[PDB]
Design a protein around this ligand. Structure first.
Ligand SMILES: CC1=C(CCC(=O)O)c2cc3nc(cc4[nH]c(cc5[nH]c(cc1n2)c(C)c5CCC(=O)O)c(CCC(=O)O)c4C)C(CCC(=O)O)=C3C
Ligand SMILES: [Cl-]
Ligand SMILES: [Fe+3]
Ligand SMILES: [Fe+3]
Length: 308
């Protein structure tokens, strides 16, 4: 009959007036100072005012629902959006599923890699919300970066960009694969997050014509602990100082859409570094709601339903 499709994501402020409560929710309820609020507000204004993450997340979630429902007639999928730090929250989506009579759901996070700080928090809040309500039964997908269509989608985007680079400069081209940084302490407990991203970079590298690649991290938080390094800005400086690369291709494969952590942390902060060393900047289009990416998620979700 009907199976809920719990599509979860970070969330973004819909209006400029939402930035305060959005930052507060991110900061575990501790309201940030005006200085922190002003810096975040400035980054949003620097990328044009607000992030298109809310509209892209909707197009991905409902594009996945249409992609699943048009490819088979074994089960009807119904997509429910559950955001981490703004409404509709994860708990609102599970409430809507239980109210709608959904008895079985499949959950997926719009981030291909698993971590205790990211996907585990998504699944924990979703499973506990359904437990307090009595339903639905949530079957969680933890990661899906190993999907071949996902690896091939990124390789195609990189190869499409590399072919605009002159041949005599391709040897001086490097591919920077990155994702959102996390506190370094997760490596002390063998969290799969750093190893999963190294695997993703390894898989993509063996399918692109770019001869050089390096793994980095970005968007590290405002804390007092060490975070996963090297930062993509610092890595860009070190790689130019050692190899004098002429082209830097940034693929933050940990993200699936053009949001603040791409439009600012890459398209501004990384471009400042390449401008400084005199190298060219390249950032292939994010997956967004491209049909190829909807086919990636369609294959992932259908593979999960078949296995249960
Ligand atoms: C693992 C991870 C993902 C990927 C997986 C997933 O997608 O879930 C992700 C995505 C995103 N993170 C986002 C935004 C922000 N994240 C922040 C802060 C933080 N993120 C963290 C982690 C992650 N974040 C952590 C551990 C903190 C520090 C918290 C603290 O120290 O208490 C902050 C505060 C300022 C700062 O970054 O310092 C902002 C504004 C947006 C939306 C951008 C937009 O609005 O377009 C997106 C897609
Ligand atoms: Cl968070
Ligand atoms: Fe974040
Ligand atoms: Fe930053």
């Amino acid at each position: 009959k009907k199976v809920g499709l719990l599509v979860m994501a970070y969330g973004t402020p819909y209006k400029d007036e939402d930035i305060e409560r959005y930052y507060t929710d991110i900061r575990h309820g501790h309201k940030p100072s005006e200085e922190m609020i002003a810096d975040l507000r400035g980054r949003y204004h620097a990328i044009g005012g607000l992030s298109p993450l809310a509209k892209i997340t909707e197009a991905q979630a409902y594009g996945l629902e249409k992609a699943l429902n048009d490819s088979q007639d074994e089960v009807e999928f119904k997509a429910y959006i559950g955001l981490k730090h703004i409404e509709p929250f994860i708990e609102d989506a599970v409430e809507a599923m239980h109210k709608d009579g959904i008895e079985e759901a499949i959950s997926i996070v719009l981030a291909p890699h698993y971590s205790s700080f990211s996907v585990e928090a998504y699944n924990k809040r979703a499973k506990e919300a359904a437990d307090k309500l009595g339903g639905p039964r949530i079957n969680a997908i933890n990661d899906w970066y190993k999907q071949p269509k996902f690896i091939q989608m990124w390789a195609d985007r990189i190869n499409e960009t590399a072919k605009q680079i002159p041949a005599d400069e391709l040897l001086d081209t490097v591919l920077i694969v990155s994702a959102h940084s996390l506190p370094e302490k997760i490596k002390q407990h063998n969290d799969p997050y750093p190893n999963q991203l190294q695997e993703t970079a390894d898989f993509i590298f063996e399918k692109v014509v770019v001869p050089h690649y390096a793994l980095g991290w970005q968007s590290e938080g405002k804390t007092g602990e060490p975070w996963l390094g090297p930062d993509v800005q610092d890595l860009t400086r070190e790689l130019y100082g050692r190899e004098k690369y002429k082209h830097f291709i940034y693929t933050p494969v940990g993200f699936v859409a053009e949001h603040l952590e791409v439009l600012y942390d890459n398209d501004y902060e990384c471009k400042v570094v390449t401008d400084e060393v005199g190298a060219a900047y390249h950032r292939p289009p994010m997956p967004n709601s491209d049909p190829e990416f909807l086919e990636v998620l369609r294959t992932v979700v259908w593979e999960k339903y078949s296995n249960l």
